[PDB]
Amino acid sequence: DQAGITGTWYNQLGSTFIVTAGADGALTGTYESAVGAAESRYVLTGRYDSAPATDGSGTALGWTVAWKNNYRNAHSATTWSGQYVGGAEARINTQWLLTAGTTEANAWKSTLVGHDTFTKVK
Amino acid sequence: DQAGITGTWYNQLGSTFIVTAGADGALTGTYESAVGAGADAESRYVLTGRYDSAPATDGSGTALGWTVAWKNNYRNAHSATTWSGQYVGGAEARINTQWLLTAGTTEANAWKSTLVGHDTFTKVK
Amino acid sequence: DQAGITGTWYNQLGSTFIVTAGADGALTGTYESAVGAGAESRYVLTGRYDSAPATDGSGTALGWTVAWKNNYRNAHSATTWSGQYVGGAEARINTQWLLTAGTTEANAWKSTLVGHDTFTKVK
Amino acid sequence: DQAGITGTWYNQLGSTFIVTAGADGALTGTYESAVGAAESRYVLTGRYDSAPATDGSGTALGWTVAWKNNYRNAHSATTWSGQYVGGAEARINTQWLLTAGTTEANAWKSTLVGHDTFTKVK
């Protein structure tokens, strides 16, 4: 939910994700990757279920980073798709797709798939 | 490209994606799914995303992604899809994507939370 | 679906998949990729399929693996295709695939490509 | 490695994977899922890189389970794609695709994606 999601998250790679959850279901913030790629911060936008189920289910959400800022351009974008799980050890459990710009001939090897787990602690 | 991406796109399922590409790399718009929204404004959902606003010029595609949370003022599927892919320009422009759709689940069902697919968007139905 | 699956398939890249489906649910054969991986370009495949699918019009679930090592080449990687066989006049195998390359722990985050191949019985 | 892979492996769900790696790069064995499931055991076949890199890289591998045996049929197949990393705390790190049989109308929601981590310790 909104209060649970807003703030700073860290994944298993040491990347930092800072996000504000809007009451309208918006996600806005900045992503700092510990791997690949002000110089190493990138805009992110996304959406989340602002009215989740109240049976203990997680909160569905996703966001995108385009790996271009004012300094740098990796001609790629990542989307994270997952769910926020609240409680003392709150997590965002994600699967991600990273697509690099390619010619048609190389499109078959355009997309990386992975999983990040974000916690509020390092 | 910004000029190439802005507009109305249709996928192989018959879903409609309307997007504005900002000079800053923002994607904003609405998504109407032909499937899974109780139909086989009702079926319209906010989307937001990002794209490479300075793509390569060698005929490489333009990397982008966007998200839809499947909640509007009518319905809630307690789920979110993210599309990751590339825009390819030309007479027959395409956005080729792979998508992940995560449903809210208990920790028990988390292993079966996430669908994976692929959508191809064109400017004609 | 055993009769349907057994034979030679081609995907949108021009790759060739020859497979025998066993009555036990085994898939065995050889894969030739038109892309990457440089008989020099044939690789062993093994997999499984549902040998008693639903009769209700649903496809037949199946998957197979190729390790990209033969007697001539080694790309230090393996692809798995997960999908369903759809029968009839224009029979198809609709797949999604994961390709993992061997990596150091440092580079594991970029170890895995994901894609989709459609196989038809004609080029 | 052949000796490194061969044996019994356990994932974070508590599923059990027993596998023999052949000298020819073959993987053969049985899989028991703790979730969704002799009754609860299923044939698996796969391949692995039998001459991996000598640079500290993991060993690429994959395998399939069709969720039919003598007792049960979930009309689906899972493929695991990943790598074996040897040493004191040996792991098989995978991502997986589970396709269910569907009608053409429901093909869009045919395939689940996940990640399992296998260790030799229960």
Author numbering:
A (entry chain DDD), D (entry chain AAA): 13 to 49, 84 to 168
B (entry chain BBB): 13 to 52, 84 to 168
C (entry chain CCC): 13 to 50, 84 to 168
What did the original publication write about this model?
The influence of the SOD dimerization domain (DD) on the performance of an asymmetric transfer hydrogenase (ATHase) resulting from anchoring a biotinylated Cp*Ir-cofactor – [Cp*Ir(biot-p-L)Cl] (1-Cl) – within Sav-SOD is reported herein.
For simplicity, the amino acid numbering for Sav-SOD was kept the same as for Sav, despite the presence of the 34 amino acids from SOD in the 3,4-loop. Residual electron density in the biotin-binding vestibule was apparent from the 2Fo–Fc map and could be modeled with cofactor 1. Further, the iridium was well localized from anomalous dispersion. Unfortunately, the dimerization domain in 1·Sav-SOD S112A could not be fully resolved due to its high flexibility. Given the similar location of the cofactors in the Sav and Sav-SOD ATHases, we propose that the enantioselectivity of 1·Sav-SOD S112A is by-and-large influenced by secondary coordination sphere interactions introduced by the dimerization domain. Single-crystal X-ray diffraction data suggest that the configuration of the cofactor in both systems, 1-H·Sav S112A and 1-H·Sav-SOD S112A, is the same, although both ATHases afford opposite enantiomers of amine 11. QM/MM calculations suggest that the DD forces the substrate PDQ 5 to preferentially present its pro-(S) face to the Ir(R) cofactor in the transition states of 1-H·Sav-SOD S112A, providing a rationale for their opposite enantioselectivity. In particular, 1-Cl·Sav S112A yielded primarily the (R)-11 product (64% ee) in 78% yield, while 1-Cl·Sav-SOD S112A afforded the (S)-11 product (27% ee) in 77% yield.
